Amino acid sequence: KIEEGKLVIWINGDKGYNGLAEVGKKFEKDTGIKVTVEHPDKLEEKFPQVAATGDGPDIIFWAHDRFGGYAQSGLLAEITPDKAFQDKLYPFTWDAVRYNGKLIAYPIAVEALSLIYNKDLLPNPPKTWEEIPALDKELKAKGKSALMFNLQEPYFTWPLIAADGGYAFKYENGKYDIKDVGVDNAGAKAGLTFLVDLIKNKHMNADTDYSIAEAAFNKGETAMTINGPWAWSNIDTSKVNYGVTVLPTFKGQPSKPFVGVLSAGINAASPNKELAKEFLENYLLTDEGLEAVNKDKPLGAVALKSYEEELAKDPRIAATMENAQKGEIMPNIPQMSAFWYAVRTAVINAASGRQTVDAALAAAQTAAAAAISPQARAFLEQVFRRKQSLNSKEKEEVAKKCGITPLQVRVWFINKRM
């Protein structure tokens, strides 16, 4: 499918899609080419589905960690910016979107979580995670709570979990070791344990999510929250006197948020590749372009040098870059999705008192390191139930959507048939 002659962009629902739509209208003004911006729920999971079959949006926005998986499967077109445009962005953001020596997306924003606090409830933010339980007690006596943040998505709990030892995939030389998952150690264990103790001691609720945490903070019901720059927009409208600062340390170590580089990748099947290139390069990645999105929902730090240095004057931007510096850029290898799924499962099962922190982290290591991830194996299990004989073309398709090589798909199936 993919209608030729226009542009269909997918971007997460928490970003400034309305602002990106504005950039689209401008593009339509100078070119006549219509651009529609959609924000499908779970787009990072949907993209590989439809893209595998040659469908989907012309352009996809998302943290670079998912992109390596997409490009390995042939779903992302290689972008070819010339020397001049390439110079307009920071080299480290370009490296984030480089897979197997190729550039597979245009870097946009450098995202990192920060500690967001209410200056009226709390004159001075806590320097450590350790003092927070005590702060909560002080605040509970006044009918308020110290902290609330999304506990459902690992992105928000990883900073504390990795603070003292956690890591995605062991990195030696220029290659990651996909069998060495760093959730399998004492540092990570202590961090998740601290998290569960906060929940067990009633300082947080195991069910709190993005909406609940945001609602609570924007109402002045909780003293602090943990979120990205995109969430600043709603806090401004709530008229809360907030500040954005460094994340609390744990065991003396800085919280280590995984830095995500929001990037725009071009669908390998798009018949509008030159248009997407032009829209992104000459329209979006300009001070006017980024600002249009920013005004809707803040991008936070950015990849465009010119605009990044203007934003640097904003203390919230500084805080964001502070946290970015203390954390680290996430890997973009195909195994990242299994990593996240693994951690997501661990945190929830541990926070629910279903599994011990230790048993949870051990299974996370097993799940994330599996040659075939649990999700995907499940995908393969479905399908097989429908068709137990793979067509040379269908297998190539299943590989793409699952994120495994055609070879793996083919060997499974044969093993499944023995």
UniProtKB/Swiss-Prot annotation:
<comment type="function">
    <text>Part of the ABC transporter complex MalEFGK involved in maltose/maltodextrin import. Binds maltose and higher maltodextrins.</text>
</comment>
<dbReference type="InterPro" id="IPR006059">
    <property type="entry name" value="SBP"/>
</dbReference>
<dbReference type="Pfam" id="PF01547">
    <property type="entry name" value="SBP_bac_1"/>
</dbReference>
<dbReference type="GO" id="GO:0015144">
    <property type="term" value="F:carbohydrate transmembrane transporter activity"/>
</dbReference>
<dbReference type="GO" id="GO:0042956">
    <property type="term" value="P:maltodextrin transmembrane transport"/>
</dbReference>
<dbReference type="GO" id="GO:0030288">
    <property type="term" value="C:outer membrane-bounded periplasmic space"/>
</dbReference>
<dbReference type="GO" id="GO:0015768">
    <property type="term" value="P:maltose transport"/>
</dbReference>
<keyword id="KW-0574">Periplasm</keyword>
<comment type="similarity">
    <text>Belongs to the bacterial solute-binding protein 1 family.</text>
</comment>
<keyword id="KW-0762">Sugar transport</keyword>
<keyword id="KW-0732">Signal</keyword>
<dbReference type="InterPro" id="IPR006061">
    <property type="entry name" value="SBP_1_CS"/>
</dbReference>
<protein>
    <recommendedName>
        <fullName>Maltose/maltodextrin-binding periplasmic protein</fullName>
    </recommendedName>
</protein>
<dbReference type="GO" id="GO:0055052">
    <property type="term" value="C:ATP-binding cassette (ABC) transporter complex, substrate-binding subunit-containing"/>
</dbReference>
<dbReference type="GO" id="GO:1901982">
    <property type="term" value="F:maltose binding"/>
</dbReference>
<comment type="subunit">
    <text>The complex is composed of two ATP-binding proteins (MalK), two transmembrane proteins (MalG and MalF) and a solute-binding protein (MalE).</text>
</comment>
<keyword id="KW-0813">Transport</keyword>
<dbReference type="InterPro" id="IPR006060">
    <property type="entry name" value="Maltose/Cyclodextrin-bd"/>
</dbReference>
